[PDB]
Amino acid sequence: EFDRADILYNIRQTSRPDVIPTQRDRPVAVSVSLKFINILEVNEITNEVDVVFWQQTTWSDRTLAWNSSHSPDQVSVPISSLWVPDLAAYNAISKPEVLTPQLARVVSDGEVLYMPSIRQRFSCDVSGVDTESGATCRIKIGSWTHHSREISVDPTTENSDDSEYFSQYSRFEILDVTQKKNSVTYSCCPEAYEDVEVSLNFRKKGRS
Amino acid sequence: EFDRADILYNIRQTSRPDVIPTQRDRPVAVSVSLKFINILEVNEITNEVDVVFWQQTTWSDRTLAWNSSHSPDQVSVPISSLWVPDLAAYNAISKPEVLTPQLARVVSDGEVLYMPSIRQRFSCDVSGVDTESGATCRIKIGSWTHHSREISVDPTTENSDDSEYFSQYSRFEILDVTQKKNSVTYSCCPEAYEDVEVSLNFRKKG
Amino acid sequence: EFDRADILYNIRQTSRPDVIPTQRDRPVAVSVSLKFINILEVNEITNEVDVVFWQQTTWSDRTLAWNSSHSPDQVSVPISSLWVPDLAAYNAISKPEVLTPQLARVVSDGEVLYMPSIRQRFSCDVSGVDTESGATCRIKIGSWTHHSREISVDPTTENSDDSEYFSQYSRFEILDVTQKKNSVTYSCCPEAYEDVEVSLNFRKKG
Amino acid sequence: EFDRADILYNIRQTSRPDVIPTQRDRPVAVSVSLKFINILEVNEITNEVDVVFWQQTTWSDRTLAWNSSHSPDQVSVPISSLWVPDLAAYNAISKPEVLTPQLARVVSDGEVLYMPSIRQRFSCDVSGVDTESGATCRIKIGSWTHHSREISVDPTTENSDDSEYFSQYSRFEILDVTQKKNSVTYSCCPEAYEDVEVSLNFRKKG
Amino acid sequence: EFDRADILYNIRQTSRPDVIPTQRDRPVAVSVSLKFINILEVNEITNEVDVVFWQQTTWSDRTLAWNSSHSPDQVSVPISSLWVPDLAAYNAISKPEVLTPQLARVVSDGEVLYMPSIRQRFSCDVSGVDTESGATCRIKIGSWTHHSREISVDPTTENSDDSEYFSQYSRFEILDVTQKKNSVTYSCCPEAYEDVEVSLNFRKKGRS
Ligand SMILES: CN1CCC[C@H]1c1cccnc1
Ligand SMILES: CN1CCC[C@H]1c1cccnc1
Ligand SMILES: CN1CCC[C@H]1c1cccnc1
């Protein structure tokens, strides 16, 4: 039997936050999904957008696991005590501003959910934002330093609505969100790195 | 008999800041209440507001308790030595800027009061800010990661006065502040998460 | 004979920066004085000012004391090794930007002087700033979490000119600086908290 | 046989982050190459530019090496656990804003690749930016404190296309990127310091 | 013989960074000299300037010394491991933005050179900036908390041109840099504090 204090103590003492939780030479499967909350600023001249999204991030780390047969089966853990995937947005032009407490939810089987609210600026196609078909801003996210044999990134499906959490008070409306996944070889390095491309189809609402 | 040094040493040494002070499998009851001090900027086109408020936050942590029959019965404690609720404003568009010393007041029975002055910008309904009925901006606050069996959130009880500490030098005036607690289920997760919705009814002076 | 290394070692090794240096039955007497250096921005529409001042802060901590019959009688100490009063400006709308090295001067009897240069923005009365009688901006400073029995705040007892070090290159000129102690209760808590109100009477130059 | 955990433990335990991995008194050869991603703001009046670039940095540190006959031959390491060259852009007018996770890739033979995305503002020649031949902004990068007997800086670009990773959505387009190795003695100090000058020839599209 | 690792270990283990390296009740002699790199913004209405300068700072700390008959005689050391003079500019209106790695160079006899590149804004006389005589902005630098028996501050000169490292792409040109030493008594305290005043004589380049 463990209480929350015991679980959290054991995790702090033994999770190796700098060690990717790879098992038998297989990639850590990371799921990412952006839930758009607001679009704060758009510039059709510069092709830049300022956006707030929840970055729902999910993966398994079995070194975190504990027998919860007589115990709580989930806890909140500061991310500084956990390994977290080194995800970056490749077309970000500002550093990610995390708006929320930096805590992940860890299940007793080792499943982790880290879902920060992030404000970040992007360079992307803003053309058509003012028309009915709208603009399509693509956001590319992947591990910065782990190639495909170490981290895979997936846009795991749901029925997950588009503007389920998007602000009704925004000047913009979301028409569609699609996720595409890619495998790229960069000039720097010989291995392929996976990314998810998130296409945000949106437009400016008219005053009426 | 303890002096302040002993109380604070004991809190610092046995601090478990990462551990939610859950007792008898009941949620930690957190009270929140926003005391509006200033509205610094409002944009009716973008529906954004920049606000300064004291986020009065209250809860009980029995692991902090000490016998105070012959001791001080209250101390100020760095929040880095305490568990603090992971509250977030859901419609915030900037990160909370804490303007005050990050100290909580702890009572010998384990009651904590943490009341930072916060500057933060929010996405909300700014329409009507210039009519007499004013605008109503809604701010939603709740635990980011603890569901309803772990953290409940409630309005601070004490009969809430609206303009109490609000700046007389602001360009805006407060007409009314109301609160409503909700219980919401999001698609990410199967459990319900509690929030308080704070409705700030305000208008431009003139 | 202690040398500076010994003094600073002893302070650092025994320092309890979390512990208010309450002397028996008494509030720690803190003296505060703002020496205005520059007024960088003024907005008469929003009633906001951006200011730079030296926050002269003085108090006694006898736990720091040492026998200096045959030793240096003063040293500079990082404030992270010292208890420091949790002062806040109640009408501040930005968090204090400290422009100087964060060192206090500690005398062998336990007297401490901490005098940071601070840039901060405030909400206050900017009306009349461009007139002959000028504007009067009031800045309210007090302990954020320590009530009247734990901290008292007074203006430094000197006659002194708080506009003495003000920049000659400023667009503004200071006409007068006055201070008044107040003591107030807040809805949150049953005790009185002390503050100093610093009234800065200033105007634009021609 | 070591697993990733062992490799990272061993590196962390013997991380000598402040020690330049000099061998027998001969300079650490550092390769630098800037991969331009975006040009965000250009001001022809002030001669200032705001740029985003991947700063591909490469060097060898044999103290990091491990036998990978039966082990992973590469790991990602927090740069806080590694010595990293003290490179600075001499004409930068803002501190480097690092946009990416601060991890370097370390090969079992001791080769290190650190490649942060950086946003930084520079002072340089913006004249002609809205002509056809374009502007040429020169960025000078070298070790801040290590002279030529301790750090050598070389452009290894490996010959990969200029506009390769540059945003197609930028307002600007890259015409050409060239590099020059320099060796400058400064008035302060008697030894020479190496730098690479990266010349970005770019324009506004039509 | 010590190697670099030994030197740095020994310094890390025994530097007392909060201890002023006073020897026998003498002041620590600190030399300061500003090498101007750029003038970014000037406002003649508000009397404010935004400047970039190398703040060349030099002093001796005998506790850092080591025998280098058969060892490297200089190392780079993080300033977090060293005592550094608590210098401040008295007319600065922003905090000193350090643009460079925060390393000092330490010689085996205990001489230290710390030379950060700093961007900072000042309140000073901007009048005359677009005439041929130019403006003269005075920058006052001294120890914040150490009086003259603990720290003296002294300007030092080289025969180099003041523009050696001034940007040729600035909108301003430097006409002259001079420096004065002062000893001032403030109201707070009974002791004299030393400062160096650095007078930057500059003007706007021809607009064409
Ligand atoms: C795959 N990353 C994305 C761009 C560069 C590359 C990389 C590789 C190794 C270390 N850092 C970055
Ligand atoms: C209640 N939170 C707000 C948005 C998602 C949710 C959540 C749940 C678990 C871990 N992180 C975030
Ligand atoms: C006197 N303080 C300033 C305003 C609220 C009050 C207070 C009391 C206890 C803890 N935090 C804040």
Ligand SMILES: CN1CCC[C@H]1c1cccnc1
């Ligand atoms: C190469 N650096 C750039 C300018 C001065 C020089 C330097 C030398 C020693 C310590 N810091 C800086």
Ligand SMILES: CN1CCC[C@H]1c1cccnc1
């Ligand atoms: C020399 N400094 C400049 C103004 C105040 C003074 C000072 C003295 C002691 C501690 N802090 C500041």
